[PDB]
Symmetry: C2
Subunit: 317 residues, 2 copies
């Protein structure tokens, strides 16, 4: 009814203004709850009518923020769930409760994601090891702070210059006692000679195995490729997107250049061009291993997860 459009408009302008909520798994839970509220607050006879409905609100919700893909791919996963249930019921009226319980299955699958990645983390960390991360990500800090229960090693958390978010990861890892080392972002190739492996997170995994992530991680991947150290992308499968990299150049999220060059700089701000991209593109050849809630996978396998999680008719959404 009307409250449905209230919640939809609140979510849309919440994504338009800022980050609400802060981390992305909460955003996937809100998106799936909003989608189950959408499918329980409408009337339809065919599944295709609900498909156009969900496509319309997905177009609106991804036009709210093109840089954040979790809502769009969650809408796309709900679309594939609807298509699979319509295909298994076609070969009618019991469709709605089946989609509700399938989305509930997806929510129970999704709530135990970071702890499933944490459970398989001990198979990748040995004692007295040098780890380098970038940015701040709750997946990687849960990974490391539970792998530190039985191992003793070293983590070099490199801050990112636009928003020094690696400082929060540093003060969160030092509470667990992992010998946290804080450095700048300019010393990454200066310390790549001693880092044994690089364990980072991401914002969005693309269809070809590539990933957008916090900016400066393409440099980190190049330095780790030069030193041949393996890259561990601790990423869940709601950061899996079928969007190819070269698509209307709407890849990077540019923010106000205040965090790079402040407004009190002078008259030189008029004759200067300051860019602040908070995301960066990493090709799949610079990635060694993905760690998802189903296990470890190669970058030569993400298209298969793509075909297992999304339908090719909904790539345009």
């Amino acid at each position: 009814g009307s409250e449905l459009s209230e919640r939809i408009e609140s979510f849309v302008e919440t994504l338009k203004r800022g980050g609400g909520p802060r981390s992305s798994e909460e955003m996937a839970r809100e998106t799936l709850g909003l989608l189950r509220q959408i499918i329980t607050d409408h009337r339809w006879s065919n599944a295709g009518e609900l498909m156009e409905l969900i496509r319309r609100e997905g177009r609106r919700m991804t036009a709210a923020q093109p840089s954040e893909t979790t809502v769009g791919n969650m809408v796309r996963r709900v679309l594939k769930i609807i298509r699979e249930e319509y295909g298994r019921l076609h070969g009618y009226a019991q469709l709605q409760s089946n989609i509700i319980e399938a989305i509930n299955e997806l929510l129970v699958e999704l709530e135990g994601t970071m702890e499933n990645i944490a459970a398989q983390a001990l198979e990748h960390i040995h004692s007295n090891e040098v780890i380098m991360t970038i940015g701040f990500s709750r997946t990687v800090e849960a990974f490391l702070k539970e792998a530190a229960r039985k191992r003793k090693f070293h983590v070099i958390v490199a801050e990112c210059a636009p928003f020094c978010q690696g400082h929060e990861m540093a003060v969160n890892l030092s509470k667990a006692g992992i010998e946290t080392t804080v450095m700048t972002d300019a010393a990454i190739f200066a310390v790549m000679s001693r880092v044994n492996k690089v364990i980072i997170g991401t914002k969005t995994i693309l269809a070809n195995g590539a990933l957008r992530a916090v900016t400066g991680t393409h440099t980190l991947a190049l330095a780790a490729k030069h030193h041949s150290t393996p890259l561990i992308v601790c990423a869940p499968m709601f950061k899996l997107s079928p969007q190819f990299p070269n698509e209307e150049d709407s890849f990077h999220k540019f923010v106000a250049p205040e965090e790079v060059l402040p407004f009190t700089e002078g008259d030189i701000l008029e004759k200067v061009s300051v860019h602040c991209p908070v995301f960066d593109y990493v090709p799949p050849e610079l990635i060694t291993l993905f760690i998802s809630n189903i296990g470890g996978n190669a970058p030569s396998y993400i298209y298969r997860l793509m075909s297992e999680l999304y339908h090719p008719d909904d790539h345009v959404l």
Copy 2:
């Protein structure tokens, strides 16, 4: 005269038959002593006559063991000493001879303190809790590591050489100094290269490219260290630097009897098999990071300059 002739042929048959003396600096000292005995026990009026005498005996001395290039380039440096002093005295019979003798004695007193000068600069390349990888056995790298271990604590992964495991010697010589060394086979090099911080090896002969022949299995070690982008230290003195280009002549690798690879008690499969045992291997200069000699650290993009500072281009074919 006759004593000098029998000394020359005892040395040449010692190099033809086996390894006499044991390590390479001893052989460089024997070569310099033999050459100073040559220039003190002959008669010459012009320097070119003595040049052709040194060339005629050095040709046989390098035809004894072509893999042992220390005698050859040591003779070649003596020839450049002859040419330098004849040029400085031409622009001359007894003063020239005594100047050659004192310059060769200068060469001996710089050559004797080579390993201690390499050890003195070892501390600027080794930090504490570092993983070092070594192939073969060499007195230069052993003095390097046991000098750097007087103030630093690190680790050494010494790898044995598969034909005859000479690196086991280095292990029992390193563990006497308390290095926390690690012995493995050379089948695990790329298995362990992901944790080795620096690779420090020796060599047998530095070529004019910056390339080097060394104990076999070190080209694989250089490839594994290039894959992992770890730097290479070649603890080599300045008498293992030869002007012979790699692909110029034949007889590069020294092949030995295949007994050390496949024993004679194998059976009748020895008659239908081809067993090779190359005890040397060729490492191109692009897989090498840094040379450490008695004059300091140098790039592989600099060895040709040391060639032109130590040898003359007319004596390359000798």
